[PDB]
Q: What sequence folds into this?
C-alpha cells in the first residue's frame, strides 16, 4: 500500500502495536559473540543491545578492537551510517578513535547528557574554547572552535588532532536538544528541519566517511533518523515514489543492527516524518 493512506488505516484501526510486533518477529538474528566476551562488559551500556559480529566497527588496535557500533550500508539509497551507543566514561577515547579512523565529518547526537534525572551518556566534548580535552588512551586532542545555539538544536565546530601524526580535522557536532523525556515529538517539523541541516553540511555525502549517529542505546531515536533520511532519498531516486515501503526499509536496516525503532510510537513518528517531508521536498 501507499504510505499516507496505510497510515490513516492504521490510525483508524488502532493497530500500531500489532504492526510493530510483526516487525519484531520478522527481524534478523545474527551472532554478537565479540560483544559478549567478558573483557568487554564495561564497553556496553545495556546488556541487551549489542552490535552483530558481521557489521560491527573494528578499532585499529591489536589489544582490543571492540566498540558498541554498527555500519548500516544502504545499497540502493547509496548512503551509509554508523550507529553507536552514547559513550561511557571508559569509552570516550574509543569513540573519537572511531571518528578519526572511519574519516567521518559529522556526529549526530539525539539525546541530552541527563534525562529523567539519570546520566544517558558521558560529557564527551569540551564546553569552553580554552578548556580542551586530551584522551590519553588513544592519543587524541579535541578542541571546541565555535558553538551556535538554536531553539531546537545546537551545532558545534570541533577540531580533532591525532597527536601521533599532528594531523588535524574539522568535525561538525549536530545536537538535537528537544526530544521529550517521554514519548515522541507531537510534530516532526523540527526533526525534519534538523535532518536537512545535517544534509546541507556535507556530513552525509560520499566524499566523507559515514556519519556517526547516537542516542543513549543507539537504536531508537538513532533508528528514526536514518530510516527517515533513507526513505526520503529513495522517494527522490525512484520513478514511482509511492513504491517506497517503510516497513521493508526498516527490516533491511535491522540486518545491520538489532532493535532499530524501540516502540510503536517511534514507528508511527517515523511514518509521520516521511509523509510530511515528502511534501516539502517538492
Ligand atoms: O521535510 C522538511 C524539510 C525541512 C527543511 C527542508 C526541506 C524539507 N527541504 N529543503 S529544506 N519539512 C517537513 C515539514 O515540516 C517541516 C519541514
A:
Amino acid at each position: 500500500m501507499e504510505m499516507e493512506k496505510e497510515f490513516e488505516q492504521i490510525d483508524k484501526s488502532g493497530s500500531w502495536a500489532a504492526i510493530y510486533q510483526d516487525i519484531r518477529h520478522e527481524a534478523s538474528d545474527f551472532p554478537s559473540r565479540v560483544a559478549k566476551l567478558p573483557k568487554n562488559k564495561n564497553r556496553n551500556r545495556y546488556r541487551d543491545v549489542s552490535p552483530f559480529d558481521h557489521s560491527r566497527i573494528k578499532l585499529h588496535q591489536e589489544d582490543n578492537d571492540y566498540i558498541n557500533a554498527s555500519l548500516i550500508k544502504m545499497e540502493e539509497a547509496q548512503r551509509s551510517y554508523i550507529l553507536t551507543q552514547g559513550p561511557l566514561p571508559n569509552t570516550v577515547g574509543h569513540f573519537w578513535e572511531m571518528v578519526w579512523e572511519q574519516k567521518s565529518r559529522g556526529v549526530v547526537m539525539l539525546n541530552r547528557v541527563m534525562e529523567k534525572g539519570s546520566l544517558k551518556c558521558a560529557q564527551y566534548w569540551p564546553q569552553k574554547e580554552e578548556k580542551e580535552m586530551i584522551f590519553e588512551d588513544t592519543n587524541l586532542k579535541l578542541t571546541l572552535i565555535s558553538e551556535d545555539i538554536k531553539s531546537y538544536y545546537t551545532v558545534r565546530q570541533l577540531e580533532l588532532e591525532n597527536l601521533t601524526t599532528q594531523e588535524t580535522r574539522e568535525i561538525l557536532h549536530f545536537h538535537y536538544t528537544t526530544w521529550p523525556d517521554f514519548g515522541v515529538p507531537e510534530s516532526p517539523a523540527s526533526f525534519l528541519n534538523f535532518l536537512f541541516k545535517v544534509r546541507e553540511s556535507g556530513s552525509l555525502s560520499p566524499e566523507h566517511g559515514p556519519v556517526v549517529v547516537h542516542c543513549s542505546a543507539g537504536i531508537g531515536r538513532s533508528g528514526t533518523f536514518c530510516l527517515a533520511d533513507t526513505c526520503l532519498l529513495l522517494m527522490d531516486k525512484r520513478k514511482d515514489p509511492s513504491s517506497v515501503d517503510i516497513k521493508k526499509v526498516l527490516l533491511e536496516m535491522r540486518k545491520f543492527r538489532m532493535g532499530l525503532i524501540q516502540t510503536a510510537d517511534q514507528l508511527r513518528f517515523s511514518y509521520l516524518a516521511v509523509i510530511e517531508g515528502a511534501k516539502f521536498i517538492m
Remarks:
- The chain has seven helices and eleven strands.
- Residues 189, 192-193, 196, 276-277, 280-281 surround JGV (CB under 6 Å).
- Residues 221-237 form the longest helix (17 residues).
- The chain has one domain: 1-282.
